[PDB]
Amino acid sequence: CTDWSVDIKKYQVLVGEPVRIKCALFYGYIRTNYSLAQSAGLSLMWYKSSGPGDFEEPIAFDGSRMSKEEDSIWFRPTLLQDSGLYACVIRNSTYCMKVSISLTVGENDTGLCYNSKMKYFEKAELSKSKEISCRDIEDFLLPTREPEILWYKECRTKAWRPSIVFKRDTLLIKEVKEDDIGNYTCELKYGGFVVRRTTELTVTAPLTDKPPKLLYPMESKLTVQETQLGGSANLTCRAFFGYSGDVSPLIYWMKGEKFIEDLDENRVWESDIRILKEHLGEQEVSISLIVDSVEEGDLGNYSCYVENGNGRRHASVLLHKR
Amino acid sequence: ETPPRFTRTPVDQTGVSGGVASFICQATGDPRPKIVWNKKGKKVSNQRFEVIEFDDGSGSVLRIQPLRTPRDEAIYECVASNNVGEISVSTRLTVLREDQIPRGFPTIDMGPQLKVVERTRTATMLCAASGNPDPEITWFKDFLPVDTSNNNGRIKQLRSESIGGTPIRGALQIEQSEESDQGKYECVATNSAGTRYSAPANLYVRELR
Ligand SMILES: *[C@@H]1O[C@H](CO[C@@H]2O[C@@H](C)[C@@H](O)[C@@H](O)[C@@H]2O)[C@@H](O[C@@H]2O[C@H](CO)[C@@H](O[C@@H]3O[C@H](CO)[C@@H](O)[C@H](O)[C@@H]3O)[C@H](O)[C@H]2NC(C)=O)[C@H](O)[C@H]1NC(C)=O
Ligand SMILES: *[C@@H]1O[C@H](CO[C@@H]2O[C@@H](C)[C@@H](O)[C@@H](O)[C@@H]2O)[C@@H](O[C@@H]2O[C@H](CO)[C@@H](O)[C@H](O)[C@H]2NC(C)=O)[C@H](O)[C@H]1NC(C)=O
Ligand SMILES: *[C@@H]1O[C@H](CO)[C@@H](O[C@@H]2O[C@H](CO)[C@@H](O)[C@H](O)[C@H]2NC(C)=O)[C@H](O)[C@H]1NC(C)=O
Ligand SMILES: *[C@@H]1O[C@H](CO)[C@@H](O)[C@H](O)[C@H]1NC(C)=O
Ligand SMILES: *[C@@H]1O[C@H](CO)[C@@H](O)[C@H](O)[C@H]1NC(C)=O
């Protein structure tokens, strides 16, 4: 049997809410859908694993809580002991394929309505619009106005400002503010069970349109560092980077046409980039240039380079004998 | 005695800045050929350029990480030689900026994860990638390419049959796991637009109970 191990989509839910586990093989791995598999004479079976590698007793479905509907498993409601991997198997007499599906069943964090290690994550820029959605609610979706989905902030009801617009399963912030940071919770009724999903929101500056800013050393002055022959020299460059996304900051030393990071030597070398200050999501970073036994060839111009999607800037230092 | 002859030549690559690029070169001959990587006739020498040798001695891999543009962008060559003869093959490296990345460049939707298998049991590393055109998924272990060439092998490659909408599923299946299988695996997604690496994932092999 060709085993695909654990599928990418993982199910994690709060003990007591209904959850339907679809078989992954149809929704990615194999081309056809369920009815066609049956028609073509293939079997579908579900087995439960406690983890990797524990081996699988078949599922003892009843018909009420743990039903085995068409192409999926339904839990109504979820139980704590339901946590585990659920292997979904398909069979010919000459063909077999299976994927396992993770199902994690957590508890409310103490005093809170979510589980910390069980949360969605989003990001938004200040002064721009963000849209938080309630997911994954596809199955508990109803085509009527009622019941409606209630949104909490820090697991508590609040009087929402009017710039915040609500539609059926989404929350819209027309202009994000630092206050809008934090844990948003959607709540839905169905079953009648209660389905809750919380997304944590982190906020950053808007995407900056300016190159980064040199501090140590400065973009005009030719600063000077004094050193002795046969000593060590730590030429530290310090720069500010605006928010350009999930990219790491590009700061590096050169020596004329020569890049330091491109030199296989034990005499000269850059340090690793240090992040000295970080605040949503703007950084002050530091990279330093080390020379361990100062030869006369070492002396002279070094220039720290700093790059961003908006540009490249550099500042120079002169290294010289005492 | 026979002169060196290539069994595997490097192919042009288009990578993305900060990422990885690997060039593969394998040759055979008697005596065993040495392999050297050059740029404009000069043997490469660079902290970000690493040459990793196969255990066979059949060749080497030239790995560049992290990729820098436009410095790394260039024509490189593999040269294989012994006292009987010499052969060389050229290859191009292109590096794009993430801002410059085209619609339809491979992305790693999910990459391999830490896995612990006991000896002689099957271990599977999974990789999900998408792109336009649909990316081919390949594997590297400890910086060398995993060879799944031979069918009926201990190590096999699985590929999603692919409906249109979802990422492509790829897997590396290692039957009868042994201590030598332990190591750092990374998945690689490639299409006509370029090449992308997943983050590394270690596979551990603990003793069979
Ligand atoms: C290269 O030089 C930089 C500059 O730091 C120096 O600071 C003064 C004490 C004087 O000696 C100055 O002449 C010089 O500018 C060094 O960077 C610094 O590194 C240290 C880590 O060793 C940082 O200190 C703290 O370490 C504690 C752990 O005990 C942490 O908890 C702190 O959060 C913090 O990291 C320090 O912040 C940092 N400063 C700057 C400005 O970068 C650097 O170590 C030195 N050598 C290299 C880079 O190889
Ligand atoms: C075993 O089944 C395969 C067909 O596999 C598929 O099964 C489902 C997952 C779904 O995708 C169905 O639509 C498919 O039928 C049979 O092998 C196929 O035979 C055809 C004959 O023309 C060939 O074109 C395909 O390539 C074959 N597929 C594979 C994977 O080899 C096979 O006949 C079935 N065996 C029995 C005993 O019924
Ligand atoms: C959103 O919830 C998270 C927890 O899910 C909060 O993060 C906690 O912050 C406190 C601050 O002192 C820490 O002591 C905890 O360890 C944090 N927990 C986790 C899991 O990170 C966070 O404070 C909440 N956000 C807001 C705006 O209240
Ligand atoms: C999926 O199954 C349906 C029946 O539910 C069938 O009509 C359809 O043809 C199948 N999918 C495709 C792509 O044909
Ligand atoms: C469960 O979550 C609710 C929020 O609706 C909370 O009031 C309750 O205290 C939580 N349970 C425990 C044991 O903390």
Find out whether B6 and B26 touch, Cβ atoms under 8 Å.
Answer: yes
| A286 CB within 6 A, ligand 1 | yes
Find out whether B130 and B106 touch, Cβ atoms under 8 Å.
Answer: yes
Tell me yes or no: is domain B99-209 CATH 3.40.50.720. Answer: no
Structure-block tokens of residue B28: 């055979």
Structure-block tokens of residue A217: 């050393």
Structure-block tokens of residue B64: 């560049």
Domain ranges of chain B: 1-98, 99-209
Find out whether A268 and A239 touch, Cβ atoms under 8 Å.
Answer: no
- The A130-133 sheet, strands edge to edge: A130-133, A170-173, A164-166
Local structure of A36: helix, strand or coil = helix
Q: Cα(A71) to centroid of ligand 4, in Å?
A: 14
Q: Which residues pair with A62 in a beta bridge?
A: none
Rounded CA separation A214/A315 (Å): 7
Question: Which domains does chain A show, CATH number per domain?
Answer: 1-109 (2.60.40.10), 110-207 (2.60.40.10), 208-322 (2.60.40.10)
- Is the CA virtual torsion B39, B44, B50, B51 positive or negative? positive
Rounded CA separation B209/B207 (Å): 6
Sequence-distant (6+) residues with CB within 8 A of B131 are B104, B105, B106, B107, B189, B191, B193
Tokens 């293939």 found at:
A42
Rounded CA separation B67/B18 (Å): 5
Ligand (nearest to CA of A39):
2
Q: Decide if A36 touches B, using CB distance below 8 A.
A: no
Are the folds of B1-98 and B99-209 the same?
yes
Sequence-distant (6+) residues with CB within 8 A of B208 are B118, B119, B120, B121
Q: Decide if A6 touches B, using CB distance below 8 A.
A: yes
- Is the CA virtual torsion A204, A205, A210, A213 positive or negative? negative
Pairing of strands B49-53, B59-64: antiparallel
Q: Cα(B191) to centroid of ligand 2, in Å?
A: 29
| A40 CB within 6 A, ligand 2 | yes
Rounded CA separation B11/A169 (Å): 49
DSSP calls for A145-173: S-S--EEEETTB-----TTEEE-SSEEEE
This structure was determined by X-ray
Residue A123 has what DSSP assignment? Answer: E
The values of phi and psi at residue A18, to 5°, are -70, 145
Rounded CA separation A22/A34 (Å): 11
Give the architecture (CATH level 2) of B1-98.
Sandwich (2.60)
Residue B76's nearest CA partner among B63, B86, B66 is B63
Residues of B in contact with A24 (CB under 8 A): none
| A122 CB within 6 A, ligand 3 | no
Local structure of A269: helix, strand or coil = strand
Rounded CA separation B15/B98 (Å): 10
Atom of ligand 2 nearest to the CA of A31: 11
